[PDB]
Protein backbone atom coordinates (compact mmCIF):
# COMPACT_ATOMS: atom_id res chain seq x y z
CA UNK A 1 0.00 0.00 0.00
CA UNK A 2 3.09 2.17 0.32
CA UNK A 3 4.48 2.74 -3.19
CA UNK A 4 2.66 5.81 -4.59
CA UNK A 5 -0.11 4.69 -6.94
CA UNK A 6 -0.62 8.05 -8.68
CA UNK A 7 1.25 10.94 -10.30
CA UNK A 8 2.23 12.19 -6.81
CA UNK A 9 2.27 15.92 -7.53
CA UNK A 10 4.74 16.66 -4.74
CA UNK A 11 4.61 20.35 -3.76
CA UNK A 12 7.56 22.46 -4.84
CA UNK A 13 9.89 23.59 -2.07
CA UNK A 14 8.22 26.74 -0.74
CA UNK A 15 10.63 29.36 0.58
CA UNK A 16 8.50 30.47 3.52
CA UNK A 17 10.07 30.63 6.97
CA UNK A 18 8.30 31.08 10.30
CA UNK A 19 9.44 34.24 12.07
CA UNK A 20 8.33 35.70 15.41
CA UNK A 21 5.29 37.96 15.41
CA UNK A 22 6.05 41.67 15.80
CA UNK A 23 3.36 42.91 18.17
CA UNK A 24 2.59 46.57 18.73
CA UNK A 25 4.77 48.59 21.08
CA UNK A 26 1.65 49.52 23.08
CA UNK A 27 0.77 45.89 23.93
CA UNK A 28 3.39 45.57 26.66
CA UNK A 29 2.88 43.14 29.54
CA UNK A 30 0.87 44.71 32.34
CA UNK A 31 -0.99 47.33 30.31
CA UNK A 32 -4.74 47.58 30.81
CA UNK A 33 -6.49 46.55 27.61
CA UNK A 34 -10.08 46.51 26.35
CA UNK A 35 -11.48 43.31 24.89
CA UNK A 36 -13.27 43.91 21.59
CA UNK A 37 -14.96 40.59 20.78
CA UNK A 38 -15.97 37.27 22.31
CA UNK A 39 -18.21 36.65 25.29
CA UNK A 40 -16.14 39.14 27.34
CA UNK A 41 -16.51 42.07 24.95
CA UNK A 42 -16.18 45.49 26.55
CA UNK A 43 -14.27 44.21 29.58
CA UNK A 44 -10.96 45.72 30.66
CA UNK A 45 -8.25 43.17 31.46
CA UNK A 46 -4.54 43.07 32.32
CA UNK A 47 -2.00 41.65 29.86
CA UNK A 48 0.13 39.15 31.78
CA UNK A 49 2.43 38.13 28.92
CA UNK A 50 2.55 37.89 25.14
CA UNK A 51 2.28 34.49 23.50
CA UNK A 52 3.58 33.97 19.96
CA UNK A 53 0.69 35.94 18.43
CA UNK A 54 -1.97 36.19 21.14
CA UNK A 55 -1.69 38.00 24.47
CA UNK A 56 -2.13 35.86 27.57
CA UNK A 57 -4.65 38.17 29.20
CA UNK A 58 -6.78 38.12 32.32
CA UNK A 59 -8.74 40.51 34.43
CA UNK A 60 -8.45 39.85 38.15
CA UNK A 61 -11.04 37.12 38.56
CA UNK A 62 -12.23 38.82 41.76
CA UNK A 63 -12.76 42.08 39.83
CA UNK A 64 -14.42 41.47 36.44
CA UNK A 65 -14.63 37.67 36.29
CA UNK A 66 -12.37 37.22 33.25
CA UNK A 67 -10.22 34.09 33.77
CA UNK A 68 -6.76 33.37 32.38
CA UNK A 69 -7.46 33.62 28.66
CA UNK A 70 -5.82 34.20 25.31
CA UNK A 71 -6.75 37.18 23.14
CA UNK A 72 -5.69 37.97 19.60
CA UNK A 73 -3.77 41.24 19.47
Amino acid sequence: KYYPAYRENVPKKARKAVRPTKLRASLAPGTVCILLAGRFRGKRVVVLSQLEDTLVVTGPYKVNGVPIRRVNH
Binding site: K1, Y3, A5
Partner: protein, 192 residues
Protein backbone atom coordinates in the same frame (compact mmCIF):
# COMPACT_ATOMS: atom_id res chain seq x y z
CA UNK B 1 5.93 -4.53 -35.93
CA UNK B 2 5.23 -2.35 -32.89
CA UNK B 3 5.34 0.97 -34.74
CA UNK B 4 3.13 -0.38 -37.52
CA UNK B 5 0.83 -1.95 -34.92
CA UNK B 6 0.47 1.35 -33.07
CA UNK B 7 -0.25 3.30 -36.26
CA UNK B 8 -3.22 0.99 -36.87
CA UNK B 9 -4.60 0.29 -33.43
CA UNK B 10 -3.66 3.62 -31.89
CA UNK B 11 -5.00 5.97 -34.55
CA UNK B 12 -7.50 4.10 -36.77
CA UNK B 13 -9.56 1.67 -34.68
CA UNK B 14 -9.14 -0.40 -31.52
CA UNK B 15 -12.01 -2.45 -30.15
CA UNK B 16 -10.56 -1.87 -26.66
CA UNK B 17 -10.72 1.93 -26.81
CA UNK B 18 -13.29 3.96 -24.88
CA UNK B 19 -13.33 7.56 -26.07
CA UNK B 20 -13.58 10.10 -23.27
CA UNK B 21 -13.88 13.86 -23.01
CA UNK B 22 -10.41 14.36 -21.54
CA UNK B 23 -8.60 11.04 -22.08
CA UNK B 24 -9.21 7.81 -23.97
CA UNK B 25 -9.38 4.53 -22.06
CA UNK B 26 -8.47 0.93 -22.89
CA UNK B 27 -10.76 -1.91 -21.83
CA UNK B 28 -7.91 -4.34 -22.51
CA UNK B 29 -7.31 -6.68 -19.59
CA UNK B 30 -3.51 -6.38 -19.73
CA UNK B 31 -3.23 -2.58 -19.65
CA UNK B 32 -1.37 -1.42 -16.54
CA UNK B 33 -2.82 2.09 -16.43
CA UNK B 34 -6.16 1.54 -18.16
CA UNK B 35 -5.53 4.50 -20.47
CA UNK B 36 -5.01 4.54 -24.23
CA UNK B 37 -1.37 5.59 -24.61
CA UNK B 38 1.55 4.54 -26.76
CA UNK B 39 3.40 3.22 -23.69
CA UNK B 40 0.25 1.79 -22.08
CA UNK B 41 -0.79 -0.32 -25.07
CA UNK B 42 -0.30 -4.06 -24.53
CA UNK B 43 -0.84 -4.56 -28.26
CA UNK B 44 1.83 -2.12 -29.45
CA UNK B 45 4.49 -3.02 -26.86
CA UNK B 46 6.03 -6.44 -27.41
CA UNK B 47 7.82 -6.34 -24.04
CA UNK B 48 5.05 -5.63 -21.55
CA UNK B 49 4.44 -6.27 -17.87
CA UNK B 50 1.26 -5.94 -15.82
CA UNK B 51 -0.12 -6.95 -12.43
CA UNK B 52 -3.51 -8.67 -12.38
CA UNK B 53 -5.68 -10.14 -9.62
CA UNK B 54 -6.83 -13.76 -9.83
CA UNK B 55 -9.25 -14.96 -7.11
CA UNK B 56 -7.58 -12.92 -4.39
CA UNK B 57 -3.96 -13.37 -5.48
CA UNK B 58 -1.87 -10.91 -7.48
CA UNK B 59 0.30 -12.02 -10.40
CA UNK B 60 2.95 -10.28 -12.49
CA UNK B 61 2.16 -10.97 -16.15
CA UNK B 62 5.04 -10.53 -18.60
CA UNK B 63 5.34 -11.03 -22.34
CA UNK B 64 8.38 -10.88 -24.62
CA UNK B 65 8.65 -10.22 -28.34
CA UNK B 66 9.92 -13.75 -29.00
CA UNK B 67 6.51 -15.24 -28.08
CA UNK B 68 4.44 -12.73 -30.08
CA UNK B 69 3.31 -15.28 -32.68
CA UNK B 70 2.13 -17.83 -30.06
CA UNK B 71 -0.96 -16.35 -28.36
CA UNK B 72 -1.43 -19.29 -25.97
CA UNK B 73 2.15 -19.01 -24.68
CA UNK B 74 2.46 -15.23 -25.11
CA UNK B 75 2.00 -14.15 -21.47
CA UNK B 76 3.82 -15.68 -18.51
CA UNK B 77 2.95 -14.93 -14.90
CA UNK B 78 4.53 -15.33 -11.48
CA UNK B 79 2.71 -15.27 -8.16
CA UNK B 80 3.47 -12.12 -6.18
CA UNK B 81 4.01 -12.58 -2.46
CA UNK B 82 1.47 -11.38 0.09
CA UNK B 83 4.25 -9.41 1.77
CA UNK B 84 4.19 -6.05 0.04
CA UNK B 85 7.90 -5.46 0.57
CA UNK B 86 8.72 -8.82 -1.01
CA UNK B 87 6.20 -8.26 -3.80
CA UNK B 88 8.13 -5.14 -4.78
CA UNK B 89 11.37 -7.13 -4.72
CA UNK B 90 9.85 -9.81 -6.96
CA UNK B 91 8.76 -7.16 -9.47
CA UNK B 92 12.27 -5.70 -9.36
CA UNK B 93 13.97 -9.06 -9.89
CA UNK B 94 11.60 -10.35 -12.58
CA UNK B 95 11.77 -7.04 -14.48
CA UNK B 96 15.55 -6.77 -14.22
CA UNK B 97 17.07 -4.41 -16.82
CA UNK B 98 13.62 -3.45 -18.06
CA UNK B 99 12.96 0.28 -18.49
CA UNK B 100 12.22 2.02 -15.21
CA UNK B 101 8.97 3.40 -16.59
CA UNK B 102 7.56 -0.12 -16.88
CA UNK B 103 8.73 -1.15 -13.40
CA UNK B 104 7.24 2.10 -12.10
CA UNK B 105 3.86 1.29 -13.67
CA UNK B 106 3.75 -2.28 -12.33
CA UNK B 107 4.59 -1.10 -8.81
CA UNK B 108 1.79 1.47 -9.03
CA UNK B 109 -0.70 -1.19 -10.13
CA UNK B 110 0.50 -3.49 -7.35
CA UNK B 111 -0.33 -0.80 -4.78
CA UNK B 112 -3.82 -0.16 -6.16
CA UNK B 113 -4.56 -3.88 -6.46
CA UNK B 114 -3.32 -4.41 -2.90
CA UNK B 115 -5.55 -1.56 -1.71
CA UNK B 116 -8.55 -2.99 -3.57
CA UNK B 117 -8.05 -6.38 -1.91
CA UNK B 118 -7.79 -4.68 1.48
CA UNK B 119 -10.99 -2.68 0.98
CA UNK B 120 -12.81 -5.76 -0.33
CA UNK B 121 -11.90 -7.69 2.82
CA UNK B 122 -12.99 -4.78 5.00
CA UNK B 123 -16.37 -4.64 3.27
CA UNK B 124 -16.87 -8.37 3.85
CA UNK B 125 -16.42 -7.97 7.61
CA UNK B 126 -18.65 -4.89 7.71
CA UNK B 127 -22.45 -5.04 7.66
CA UNK B 128 -24.09 -2.97 4.94
CA UNK B 129 -27.74 -2.82 3.83
CA UNK B 130 -28.72 -4.81 0.77
CA UNK B 131 -29.78 -2.78 -2.26
CA UNK B 132 -33.37 -3.71 -3.18
CA UNK B 133 -34.26 -2.86 -6.81
CA UNK B 134 -37.48 -0.92 -7.36
CA UNK B 135 -39.81 -2.71 -9.76
CA UNK B 136 -41.92 -0.34 -11.91
CA UNK B 137 -44.73 -2.83 -12.61
CA UNK B 138 -45.03 -3.83 -8.96
CA UNK B 139 -45.01 -0.18 -7.90
CA UNK B 140 -47.76 0.68 -10.39
CA UNK B 141 -49.90 -2.27 -9.33
CA UNK B 142 -49.61 -1.68 -5.59
CA UNK B 143 -50.27 2.04 -6.09
CA UNK B 144 -53.57 1.40 -7.88
CA UNK B 145 -54.60 -1.48 -5.62
CA UNK B 146 -53.92 0.70 -2.57
CA UNK B 147 -56.18 3.46 -3.89
CA UNK B 148 -59.01 0.97 -4.35
CA UNK B 149 -58.32 -0.55 -0.93
CA UNK B 150 -58.43 2.86 0.77
CA UNK B 151 -61.73 3.68 -0.94
CA UNK B 152 -63.13 0.26 -0.02
CA UNK B 153 -61.87 0.61 3.55
CA UNK B 154 -64.25 3.46 4.48
CA UNK B 155 -61.93 4.41 7.32
CA UNK B 156 -63.96 7.18 8.96
CA UNK B 157 -67.19 5.18 8.68
CA UNK B 158 -65.60 2.13 10.33
CA UNK B 159 -63.86 4.22 12.99
CA UNK B 160 -67.13 5.92 13.90
CA UNK B 161 -69.06 2.63 13.80
CA UNK B 162 -66.62 0.95 16.19
CA UNK B 163 -66.50 3.91 18.58
CA UNK B 164 -70.29 3.99 18.88
CA UNK B 165 -70.47 0.19 19.18
CA UNK B 166 -68.11 0.17 22.16
CA UNK B 167 -70.02 3.13 23.62
CA UNK B 168 -73.22 1.05 23.65
CA UNK B 169 -71.33 -1.94 25.06
CA UNK B 170 -70.13 0.26 27.92
CA UNK B 171 -66.41 -0.46 27.73
CA UNK B 172 -66.00 2.65 29.90
CA UNK B 173 -67.14 2.98 33.51
CA UNK B 174 -70.72 3.72 34.57
CA UNK B 175 -70.85 7.19 33.03
CA UNK B 176 -68.41 7.94 30.19
CA UNK B 177 -65.90 10.78 30.23
CA UNK B 178 -65.82 11.16 26.42
CA UNK B 179 -69.52 12.10 26.22
CA UNK B 180 -71.62 14.97 27.54
CA UNK B 181 -75.00 14.92 29.28
CA UNK B 182 -77.22 14.97 26.19
CA UNK B 183 -75.32 12.20 24.38
CA UNK B 184 -75.18 10.00 27.49
CA UNK B 185 -78.89 10.51 28.19
CA UNK B 186 -79.77 9.73 24.57
CA UNK B 187 -77.61 6.60 24.66
CA UNK B 188 -79.14 5.43 27.95
CA UNK B 189 -82.69 5.72 26.60
CA UNK B 190 -81.75 3.85 23.41
CA UNK B 191 -79.54 1.01 24.67
CA UNK B 192 -81.84 0.27 27.62
Amino acid sequence: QDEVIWQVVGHEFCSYRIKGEAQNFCRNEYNVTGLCNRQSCPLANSRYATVREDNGKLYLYMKTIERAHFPSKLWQRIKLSKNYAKALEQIDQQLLYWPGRQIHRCKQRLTRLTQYLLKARRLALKHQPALIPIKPKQAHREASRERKALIAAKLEKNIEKELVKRLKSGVYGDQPLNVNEEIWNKVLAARE
